[PDB]
Design brief:
homodimer; Peroxisomal Thiolase, Chain A, domain 1; two-stranded antiparallel sheet; transferase; duplicated BABABABB fold; dimeric
Chain lengths: 411, 411
């Protein structure tokens, strides 16, 4: 059973258009949420989202070969390129067949559908673009990324809502571990800031109606009224240890555990006591061959929803027990917003970078605490911390629970 | 490596509302393709499709709960129930945690999107149903299926276009094999017969505009002009050998191999000479520990497209070699149509049932033999054949290739 290491990272987030902007800004507690500029939010009750700032796709890809990509694919391509450059992974005739792509998108090409549906309705089916289908479907990020990079190994996408990025990485992890690829370009991507997504998520009352930016998203806090939608992509290049060392690559961290469970409870509501989340955390630690004692850091799912944030704390308290007081939890979503599919990818990056730099990003807006949520939230300011094992949680709609455990590399 | 066996099957297809009907009808070369009744097809050039016949959802699910499910989820629920009943898998307090769900849908809730987007446009954002999001996204079939059955093990969905059914099963296979679950309810589902899907696929020139119900879908033959769209769901209950034997379950077949590759060539067009397809077939055989000599049957992808069908034969020829003209290949899409997400599941079923009943389903409409596609396609009439190893290919849009290898249960 081969050892799997992280050799590259790529990111586009509301707080940075590359990994170290994103990461540095994350340690300074920067706010990615702001008034929506992408759409006219007049008829809605939500006007805030974590949009990418100062981002031009034409800086990265030619116009003709971009007009044929939905934003969610655009972000994946840019982030994957960054991660491959970072790992200095050479994808060529000798290596391509064993270098795969496994990038999920929870929502897919929402904007593309809206445009093409308007067309069919308002102007007839005959004027629907021949590029509609390959722009719309969730696996098109993976397909387009593999074409762009020449990667030919195992090729897929795990679509599991908010847990999409974490599951996709986990699958890619087990693909390398079983020896079916030497390297995988993996993670999550999402472009949900659209008419239909805002109207859909607020219809189901999952979105915050707060118009003020300084408290809109406030994980684990009094007054939290749902998550704030964000966009971006979190991509990892993961390799076998053999491969990484053979080509001489720098190692960020090792991936050692992956657990996934289902609540089998409600289609949108978390299972009471966060029971599914607990079983997922336990499975990931059983995979890693560790116990709760060994985990210093946990990047929480913490979306700033009443039940979610409460149920996660309950899950953590049940699973860790005594070690719950002596455990650093952070919800980086407080800065980025909930990136949906892409959130698990970006959080895997945050987690692995936390092990490397011995730091933990804060949970900003930690103003009005909660007697129910009595965990070490690493409030408002970044703390130093020596980490050996980090956890990342993703507990999304549909009852999907996904957890990854990362480990410091030393030999 | 733990041995993984198929204990249950469930199916909804254009040629039957359960496995027995579907399979029996399949061995008689029944035509599932007929004029579309789902929607007014007047402004389009395509008027045929493989719709479910005499299927009412209220026979299976109460109207109040069905109204909150897109057809693709409705199909997944009904087929999963059948496979569970078939396997007599009991999901309870002691088992649920180790029984997972992994059901993919390549397209998800196309109809739900069309309805909600229309309301958003000509009425307003506040008239959008609160059930829109959980009806729309692709992982909701897995979410709703696990809730309905109480299954709580690994929870996910592999979305890879036409290869969705096959990849999903491959993932579930690997989950049991690594011992992360005792059983998995897995497969593909799809409800693609919608305005936006017909307009989308014809715009990209992938659908036949043929009206002749008896020649619309002619896999591998002379006049083929694209695929014919179908709906349905193909669900398997797969289990560890130890588990199936402990609870006393009848075994259909064993899953022994799984390969997945990426073309890294074109978004819709197959890699030249089906090179990616060949690597996927080789990977699955390497996984299974067999050579091309050992395969008696291969359920081909064969969607009735010029380039696709030709490139698959090329892939088969390149990979099997001498054994190529001693291989029994067949494309069951000739009868069901191309079910997209569901097709991988429906074909895994056919492949496994082919090993059990030692009978191969035919490729109907094999009227005009194309000189380039010179394979043993089991023309028009079902043949008898002893099978030890069966292959199922799925090579779809986005450059995704997925191959499973099944094996007659030994001991």
């Amino acid at each position: 059973n081969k050892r799997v290491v992280i050799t590259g990272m790529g990111a586009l987030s509301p707080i940075g258009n590359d990994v170290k902007t994103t990461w540095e800004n994350a340690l300074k507690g920067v706010n990615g949420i702001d008034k929506i500029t992408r759409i006219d939010t007049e008829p809605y009750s939500v006007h805030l989202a974590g949009e990418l700032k100062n981002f031009n796709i034409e800086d990265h890809i030619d116009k003709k070969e971009a007009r044929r990509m939905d934003r969610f694919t655009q972000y994946a391509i840019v982030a994957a390129r960054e991660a491959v450059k970072d790992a200095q992974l050479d994808i060529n005739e000798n290596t391509a067949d064993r270098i795969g792509v496994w990038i999920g998108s929870g929502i897919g090409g929402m904007e593309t559908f809206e445009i093409a549906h308007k067309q069919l309705m308002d102007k007839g089916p005959r004027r629907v673009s021949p590029f509609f289908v390959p722009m719309l479907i969730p696996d098109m990020a993976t397909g387009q990324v593999s074409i762009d990079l020449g990667a030919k190994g195992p090729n897929g996408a795990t679509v599991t809502a908010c847990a999409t990025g974490t599951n996709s990485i986990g699958e890619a992890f087990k693909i390398v571990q079983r020896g079916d690829a030497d390297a995988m370009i993996t993670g999550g991507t999402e472009a949900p800031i659209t008419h239909m997504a805002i109207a859909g998520f607020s219809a189901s009352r999952a979105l915050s109606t707060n118009d003020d930016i300084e408290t809109a998203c406030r994980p684990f806090q009094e007054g939290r009224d749902g998550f704030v939608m964000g966009e971006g992509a979190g991509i990892l290049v993961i390799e076998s240890l053999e491969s990484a060392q053979a080509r001489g690559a720098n190692i960020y961290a090792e991936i050692v555990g992956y657990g996934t469970t289902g609540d089998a409870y409600h289609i949108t509501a978390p299972a009471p006591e966060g029971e599914g989340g607990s079983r997922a955390m336990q499975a990931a630690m059983d995979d890693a061959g560790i116990e709760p004692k060994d985990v210093q850091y946990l990047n929480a799912h913490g979306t700033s929803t009443p039940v979610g944030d409460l149920n996660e704390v309950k899950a953590i308290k049940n699973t860790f027990g005594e070690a719950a007081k002596h455990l650093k939890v952070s919800s980086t979503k407080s800065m980025t917003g909930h990136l949906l599919g892409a959130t698990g990818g970006i959080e895997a990056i945050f987690s692995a970078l936390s092990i490397k730099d011995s730091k933990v990003a804060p949970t900003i807006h930690a103003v009005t605490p909660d007697p129910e949520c009595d965990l070490d939230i690493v409030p408002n300011e970044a703390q130093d911390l020596d980490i050996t094992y980090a956890m990342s949680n993703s507990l999304g709609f549909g009852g999907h629970n996904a957890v990854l455990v990362f480990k410091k590399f030393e030999a």
